[PDB]
């Protein structure tokens, strides 16, 4: 996915879909989050829609292709059981002058 240079804060840039090929009957709900290494001070916000989709929102006003042209967002999908099991999918966000599947295993 991508973000515009003149993008303002709280702007939706992409929607993520948590997929479990081993769940034919849609019994599993997945919790979204940023991996521990990216959970604080990101330039993006994850909003869990609570229906196996999450939004990637801009957390800052303006992105400079020269300062940082690409962001690697490690997104955690987690089950809701004891013990908890998680999977990680890295999202590549590109800065430009101006649907996404995360699998559970």
């Amino acid at each position: 996915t991508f973000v515009c240079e003149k993008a303002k804060a709280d702007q939706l840039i992409q929607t993520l879909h948590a997929v479990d090929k081993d769940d034919p009957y849609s019994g599993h709900q997945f919790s979204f989050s940023l991996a521990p290494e990216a959970a604080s001070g990101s330039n993006f916000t994850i909003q869990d829609n609570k229906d196996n989709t999450a939004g990637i929102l801009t957390r800052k006003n303006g992105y400079n292709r020269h300062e940082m042209s690409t962001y690697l967002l490690p997104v955690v999908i987690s089950d809701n059981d004891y013990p908890v099991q998680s999977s990680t999918g890295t999202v590549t966000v590109r800065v430009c002058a101006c649907p996404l599947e995360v699998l559970f295993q």
């Epitope: 019994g27 709900q29 919790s31 940023l34 604080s40 987690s78 059981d81 908890v84």
Partner: antibody
Amino acid sequence: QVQLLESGGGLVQPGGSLRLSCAASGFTFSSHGMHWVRQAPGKGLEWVSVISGSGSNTGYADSVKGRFTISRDNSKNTLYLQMNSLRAEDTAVYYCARQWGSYAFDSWGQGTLVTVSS
Amino acid sequence: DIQMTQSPSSLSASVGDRVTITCRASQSISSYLNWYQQKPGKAPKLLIYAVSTLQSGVPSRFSGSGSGTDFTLTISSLQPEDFATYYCQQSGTFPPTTFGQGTKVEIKR
């Protein structure tokens, strides 16, 4: 949609026993870890017990270990908390809660008050 | 157990104010730090998951940050409906899970 309906609270004497129930609906019950979290009047939140989706794996806070038992009936979509050897310090509002990810709580019951008194 | 301490225990603020609630852990915790809103006579509602994940139907004025031992919940533009007691919770070395003592937010008027 997601609903957690509690029952079973009330007056019980010290050394007594009480059973709480939590009827679930609006989601796949067996897919979630289910928990008991209590709040003493005018105080904070205290996690009590956990049970896996299957009902095989259980956990307890040190404060209730050996006195309380958590169970679930997946056929009836019901969570239980069997309390025994009740003490004055067990007096609280008891909530059942659905697990979200790594033990955060996204849906809670209305609560049920348990008063331990002679 | 890991003890979670919130500051302040009570706060009073004006509509439009940027309010901050601090959460300190007795030891370094990873990123399993969650935030709750509890309205009087109601059960807690999950606002923020794993330090910064905004929940569905939670206004974007609610945000979280922090690492190690210090965490923050920020309400960027306080609204009259934000009246409640807020709790932080550590859930990264489970069992057990421990909560902060709560921060009551009062609306100045």
